[PDB]
Design a protein around this ligand. Structure first.
Ligand SMILES: *[C@@H]1O[C@H](CO)[C@@H](O[C@@H]2O[C@H](CO)[C@@H](O[C@@H]3O[C@H](CO)[C@@H](O)[C@H](O)[C@H]3NC(C)=O)[C@H](O)[C@H]2NC(C)=O)[C@H](O)[C@H]1NC(C)=O
Ligand SMILES: *[C@@H]1O[C@H](CO)[C@@H](O[C@@H]2O[C@H](CO)[C@@H](O[C@@H]3O[C@H](CO)[C@@H](O)[C@H](O)[C@@H]3O)[C@H](O)[C@H]2NC(C)=O)[C@H](O)[C@H]1NC(C)=O
Ligand SMILES: *[C@@H]1O[C@H](CO)[C@@H](O[C@@H]2O[C@H](CO)[C@@H](O[C@@H]3O[C@H](CO)[C@@H](O)[C@H](O)[C@@H]3O)[C@H](O)[C@H]2NC(C)=O)[C@H](O)[C@H]1NC(C)=O
Ligand SMILES: *[C@@H]1O[C@H](CO)[C@@H](O[C@@H]2O[C@H](CO)[C@@H](O)[C@H](O)[C@H]2NC(C)=O)[C@H](O)[C@H]1NC(C)=O
Ligand SMILES: *[C@@H]1O[C@H](CO)[C@@H](O[C@@H]2O[C@H](CO)[C@@H](O)[C@H](O)[C@H]2NC(C)=O)[C@H](O)[C@H]1NC(C)=O
Ligand SMILES: *[C@@H]1O[C@H](CO)[C@@H](O[C@@H]2O[C@H](CO)[C@@H](O)[C@H](O)[C@H]2NC(C)=O)[C@H](O)[C@H]1NC(C)=O
Ligand code: NAG
Ligand code: NAG
Ligand code: NAG
Ligand code: NAG
Ligand code: NAG
Ligand code: NAG
Ligand code: NAG
Ligand code: CA
Lengths: 48, 973
């Protein structure tokens, strides 16, 4: 939340559900990365 | 250097030779004599500039009243029929039968859409419609993204089927009716006669974007003028998708405004400010809207939201009253995502009486609270909208006109006044049209006042199109001089009628394209703006012209005679001539009609030929068989009658004219007798001139061609071999040299074009023409213009025989007014003949402009074809320059210096001619050059728009409009 919270302001219409905008969504994203499923997409979103 | 007297002797000899050659070759005196020799085959009739304008205004008022009568009929029938609707929900059993536009015409399509049945029309070809139309029913247009077959749509098609009878009744009452359409509030458009849509849904690779709710006529007839202030949130939270969506939505809503609405865009992020250089409400025309769009598509999201400051700024700018305003509908458009403050105290301070509507828009997908903005919406008598994606922008940025129409509905029959739109291009490719509009109200349970919930909204807008060509038929011009014309004005400055008004859309700014971001299969939108050209932008603006325009905007009748600058038809020359402006208002409408009549045009020649044999001889003079005897003959493609039509091909048009006039008698049961009689009389006169005088000297040394151009539309070029070198319009009223010779009182030399394909420099020669002036009973008349084409080589031998061929010491050239080259001395400038002198000798031309031997002034062309730059053809603004003589003095002398040089020059003006003689030092003596002086259409972006808003042109908006009704419920958001 500190790092990627509120920084997903991309001008395109692509939807990125796995973000860190609030605590429940950050928890869901962290759990998803923990399971290892599609964590590289979250990493790419954080990088961009 | 030669003395002044020697140069005077040279120029006197040259001008005497040229004038004698032109006079004895063209034969002005002979034509004047034979015009004065008869005085019995015609009569001189006055041109009363007062009565003509009154007659034309009465005709225009009668036409518009006829169009308006067909509007109230349709509106009343639609209201009555919809009042008796049942709103059934089961359409599968009872199919709705209609002809859907933009559908495949192949009968084997087997659509079989549930609840509906299609129609296959015949689509015969028709006049007054350059399409295929069917008079048996009406066509229905449904927007592509609106699904036909819905309960709402099918119900509309059910009760709108009763409009076909009234459509047919209106058409049979007046067979000249163009498109008459019902624009439904549900998106439907039913128009008569039936005709296939220009753009199918997906049959070609192109698609269509046409919603009747966004058309200018629908918007005009759906509500009153607005004082809109768009408020944009640019705080940090709107960063990302929602900011781009907000920008697109603001542009789309700006596209819904007209010239009667006033708008300004402001942004707030902890501080409120304007987005452009306007700082207050502006007229919201094409230029101002372009500026606002450009400013809007530059905002960035940064900071903390503050609704109080933004709303204070919006209210203060809505309370200005210092500037021009619509003064009708003060509304605020708030674009944001979400918030937590509602700014109750700001609304209590600024909008306690609730005179300002607040429309709130929640844009994008977000988790922010939307309650406060809904409270703002349906607290200040407004509405609340949501725009989650691009697909919702168009639908949600046009719905606010439903709320604005509630007081107009509650007014009742006081609001059913027919309004006429600005000039725009018809969507069905009919040309420049204006549309009369009339709202249609929902009256369900009117006698009992049962529901009154949805009845506050309109059913739709009536519409009838009137082509600008119909109005031109009511203002005939062939009894006037080619310099005379009619023109009409809005109470906004825009011209309904003008010779300089063209079907091209109005260009704004400079066109820039990015070809690297253009997919080849996208079908980008083309245009939707109207053709709004001001009176001052259609002619050369003048101080007296501004006074006349202001006087005739506010319904006054008057007359003025003055001296003004007149631009030639080809934008190369400017002339000085007397003109008389006579204007009167049109009672039925807010239009004002004026007639511009120069001197020497108060009288015209009316043919009085009443002998069959004389008419037969005059008709057989203009036959292709004896073009070797009477010269090559051209005929103006005028509308003599509907039996024969113009074809833009003079040979076949002349053949059809001859065959029609020889087949049936000239008794003309349904043909215009005056035009044919004038044509025959002038053809006979020109044939007599050719046979009696021109044929005596078959070949002349210095003359390459001889031509005579008269009124009525008769043009003769004596050598048939020179007939193929004639590149002028067969219509004599569109000949630039004809009008220039009419204005001038001497011989006019027309410079040939440059960088143009076809023989136009040497094989044709320089053209000099003079206007024929006759005196019948002390009345000045200029019926014809004659002239010759002189050989360039013969003129070269004249000129050279100091000033010697290819001289390295002295340069001697001849120019006409306008700065174009007609004679040289070095056989280098001679090849580049007809060029502006500033493009071959910029220093001398600039100095000539400085010493005031050449005058110039600039103007803007708002309908031009432009090549799009990098940041096929697009429309923009081109700046035009034309040079002319200003000083009456004949001789100038001086020395020009450029980098420690000294070149002695002595320019001399040839008497009784628009020519000038220049004798200057060779350019090779001092190799100095700063920059070329270009006289050509240059792509331009001016004038500066947010400098004209401070001192705008005079305007007179509508006086009656409806808002703030007490009976409005306003319980929706
Ligand atoms: C510039 O070119 C001109 C033609 O391109 C030459 O014009 C010719 O000049 C002749 C002598 O001045 C004229 O002869 C005279 O013609 C008139 C009527 O045309 C007669 O009344 C005169 O009697 C006759 N002169 C004599 C001695 O008989 C030619 O008519 C005239 N050409 C035309 C078409 O009018 C100029 O001469 C030439 N400039 C110079 C300096 O030579
Ligand atoms: C909208 O659609 C409805 C349904 O198709 C149309 O109503 C139909 O109107 C016709 C004309 O009156 C009716 O025909 C008549 O029926 C009566 C018996 O009901 C018969 O005695 C008459 O001789 C005549 O045949 C038809 O019944 C009626 N349909 C229904 C279901 O009621 C309506 O006209 C359409 N709207 C418009 C504006 O056309
Ligand atoms: C013009 O105004 C009248 C009333 O002022 C509108 O009539 C109303 O139309 C609505 C639909 O928009 C009807 O509601 C529907 O009723 C059916 C039952 O028949 C129900 O099953 C539907 O779910 C829906 O609720 C309403 O009954 C009807 N009222 C009356 C008195 O007719 C009319 O629609 C307006 N015209 C247009 C073009 O919108
Ligand atoms: C435009 O609005 C301004 C609002 O400030 C007007 O200026 C004020 O006018 C009142 C009336 O006399 C004065 O008492 C104030 O001192 C003025 N303020 C300023 C800052 O000048 C102005 O009169 C209005 N009209 C025009 C044409 O500017
Ligand atoms: C329609 O326009 C014409 C323009 O000529 C008006 O005609 C004149 O209007 C003035 C203005 O009051 C009158 O003093 C004249 O007597 C009118 N002329 C004639 C011959 O009557 C006419 O008044 C306009 N129609 C209406 C209803 O105002
Ligand atoms: C069109 O050209 C005329 C030149 O005749 C311009 O009129 C001159 O304008 C200057 C600058 O104001 C004055 O000093 C001259 O006295 C004017 N001349 C005359 C004869 O009045 C005119 O301004 C030009 N129009 C435009 C729109 O540029
Ligand atoms: C911050 C800034 O300079 N913005 C401007 C903008 O106002 C202008 O509209 C645009 C030109 O189209 O150039 C940029
Ligand atoms: C207006 O209508 C009347 C009767 O319908 C007709 O006589 C007249 O010619 C029409 N005028 C125009 C300009 O169409
Ligand atoms: C224009 O009118 C004035 C005043 O009558 C006159 O002196 C002048 O010669 C006229 N100009 C032309 C070209 O007729
Ligand atoms: C235009 O004319 C010039 C003559 O100065 C020539 O050099 C050039 O090729 C021409 N261009 C075109 C497109 O005809
Ligand atoms: C050229 O024009 C400028 C601007 O009017 C003027 O100051 C200057 O004196 C002019 N030069 C000559 C040689 O006329
Ligand atoms: C023509 O020019 C001369 C000198 O260049 C000047 O004295 C005279 O006033 C000018 N004529 C006008 C301005 O009408
Ligand atoms: C004009 O003056 C400059 C600067 O002194 C000099 O370089 C130049 O040569 C001079 N012009 C000529 C033609 O000599
Ligand atoms: Ca915010």
């Amino acid at each position: 939340m500190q790092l990627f919270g509120g920084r997903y302001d991309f001008e395109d219409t692509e939807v990125r559900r796995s973000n860190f905008d609030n605590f429940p969504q950050a928890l869901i994203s962290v759990f998803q990365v923990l399971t290892g499923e599609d964590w590289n997409s979250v990493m790419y979103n954080g990088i961009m | 250097f030669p003395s002044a007297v020697t140069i005077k002797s040279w120029v006197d000899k040259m001008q005497e030779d040229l004038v004698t050659l032109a006079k004895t070759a063209s034969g002005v005196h002979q034509l004047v004599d034979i015009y004065e020799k008869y005085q019995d085959l015609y009569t001189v009739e006055p041109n009363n500039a007062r009565q003509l304008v009154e007659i034309a205004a009465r005709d225009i008022e009668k036409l518009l009243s006829n169009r308006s009568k067909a509007l109230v009929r349709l509106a009343l029938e639609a209201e009555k029929v919809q009042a008796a609707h049942q709103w059934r929900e089961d359409f599968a059993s009872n199919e709705v039968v209609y002809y859907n536009a933009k559908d495949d015409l192949d009968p084997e399509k087997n659509d079989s859409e549930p609840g509906s049945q299609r129609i296959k029309p015949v689509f015969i070809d028709d006049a007054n419609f350059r399409r295929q139309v069917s008079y048996q029913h009406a066509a229905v247009h449904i927007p592509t993204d609106i699904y036909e077959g819905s309960t709402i749509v099918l119900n509309e098609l059910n009760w709108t089927s009763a409009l076909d009878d009234v459509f047919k009744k209106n058409r049979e009452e007046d067979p000249s009716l163009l498109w008459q359409v019902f624009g439904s509030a549900t998106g439907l458009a039913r128009y008569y006669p039936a005709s296939p849509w220009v753009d199918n849904s997906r049959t070609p690779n192109k698609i269509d974007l046409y919603d009747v709710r966004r058309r200018p006529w629908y918007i005009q007839g759906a509500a009153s003028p607005k004082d809109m202030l768009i408020l944009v949130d640019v705080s940090g939270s709107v960063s990302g998708l929602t900011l781009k969506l907000i920008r697109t939505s603001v542009s789309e809503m700006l596209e819904t405004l007209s010239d009667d609405d006033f708008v300004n865009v402001a942004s707030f992020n902890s501080n409120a400010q304007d987005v452009s250089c306007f700082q207050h409400l502006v007229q919201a025309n094409v230029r101002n809207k372009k500026v606002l769009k450009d400013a809007v598509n530059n905002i960035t999201a940064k900071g903390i939201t503050d609704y109080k400051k933004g709303f204070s700024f919006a209210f203060e700018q809505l309370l200005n009253y210092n500037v021009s305003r619509a003064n009708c509908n003060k509304i605020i458009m708030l674009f944001t995502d979400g918030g937590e403050e509602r700014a109750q105290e700001i609304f209590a301070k600024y909008n306690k009486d609730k005179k300002v509507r607040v429309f709130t828009f929640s844009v994008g997908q977000h988790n922010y609270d939307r309650g406060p903005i809904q409270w703002m919406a349906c607290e200040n008598k407004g509405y609340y909208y949501e725009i989650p994606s691009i697909g919702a922008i168009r639908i949600n940025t046009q719905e606010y006109l439903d709320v604005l129409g509630r007081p107009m509905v509650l007014a009742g029959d006081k609001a059913k006044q027919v309004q006429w739109t600005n000039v725009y291009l018809d969507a069905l490719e009919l040309g420049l049209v204006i549309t009369g509009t009339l709202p249609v109200f929902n009256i369900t349970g009117q006698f009992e006042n049962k529901t009154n919930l949805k009845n506050q909204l309109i059913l739709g807008v009536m519409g009838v199109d009137v082509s600008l060509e119909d109005i031109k038929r009511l203002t005939p011009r062939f009894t006037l001089c080619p310099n005379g014309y009619y023109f009409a004005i809005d109470p906004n400055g825009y011209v309904l009628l003008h010779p300089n008004l063209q079907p091209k859309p109005i260009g704004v700014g400079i066109p820039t394209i990015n070809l690297r971001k253009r997919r080849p299969n996208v079908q980008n939108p083309k245009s939707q703006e109207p053709v709004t050209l001001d009176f001052l932008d259609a002619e050369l603006e003048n101080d007296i012209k501004v006074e006349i325009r202001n006087k005739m905007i506010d319904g006054e009748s008057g007359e003025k005679t003055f001296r003004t600058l007149v631009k030639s038809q080809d934008e190369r020359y400017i002339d000085k001539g007397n003109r008389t402006y006579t204007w009167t208002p049109v009672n039925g409408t807010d239009y004002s009609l004026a007639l511009v009549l120069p001197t020497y045009s108060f009288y015209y020649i009316k043919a009085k030929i009443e002998e069959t044999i004389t008419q037969a001889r005059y008709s057989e003079t203009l036959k292709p068989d004896n073009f070797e005897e009477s010269g090559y003959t051209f005929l103006a493609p005028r509308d003599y009658c509907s039996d024969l039509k113009p074809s833009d091909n003079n040979t076949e048009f002349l053949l059809n004219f001859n065959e029609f006039i020889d087949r049936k008698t000239p008794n003309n049961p349904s043909c215009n007798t005056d035009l044919i009689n004038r044509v025959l009389l002038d053809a006979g006169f020109t044939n007599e001139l050719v046979q009696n005088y021109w044929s005596k000297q078959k070949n002349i040394k210095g003359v390459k061609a001889r031509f005579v151009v008269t009124d009525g539309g008769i043009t003769r070029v004596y050598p048939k071999e020179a007939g193929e070198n004639w590149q002028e319009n067969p219509e004599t009223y569109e000949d630039s040299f004809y009008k220039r010779s009419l204005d001038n009182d001497n011989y006019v030399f027309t410079a040939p074009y440059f960088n143009k394909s076809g023989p136009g420099a040497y094989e044709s020669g320089i053209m000099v023409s003079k206007a024929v002036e006759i005196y019948i009973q002390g009345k000045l008349l200029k019926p014809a213009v004659v002239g010759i084409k002189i050989d360039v080589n013969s003129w070269i031998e004249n000129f050279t025989k100091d000033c010697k061929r290819n001289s390295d010491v002295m340069d001697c050239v001849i120019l006409d007014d306008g700065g174009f080259l007609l004679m040289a001395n070095h056989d280098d400038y001679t090849n580049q003949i007809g060029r502006f002198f500033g493009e071959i000798d910029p220093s001398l031309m600039r100095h000539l402009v400085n010493i005031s031997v050449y005058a110039f002034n600039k103007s803007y062309d708002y309908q031009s074809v432009c090549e799009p730059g990098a940041a096929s053809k697009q429309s923009c603004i081109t700046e035009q320059t034309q040079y002319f003589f200003d000083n009456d003095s004949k001789s100038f002398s001086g020395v020009l210096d450029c980098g420690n040089c000294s070149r002695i020059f002595h320019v001399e003006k040839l008497m009784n001619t628009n020519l000038i003689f220049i004798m200057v030092e060779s350019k090779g003596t001092c190799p100095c050059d700063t920059r070329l002086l270009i006289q050509a259409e240059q792509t331009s972006d001016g004038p500066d728009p947010c400098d004209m808003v401070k001192q705008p042109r005079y305007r007179k908006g509508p006086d009656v409009c409806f808002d703030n009704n007490v009976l409005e419920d306003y319980t929706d958001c």
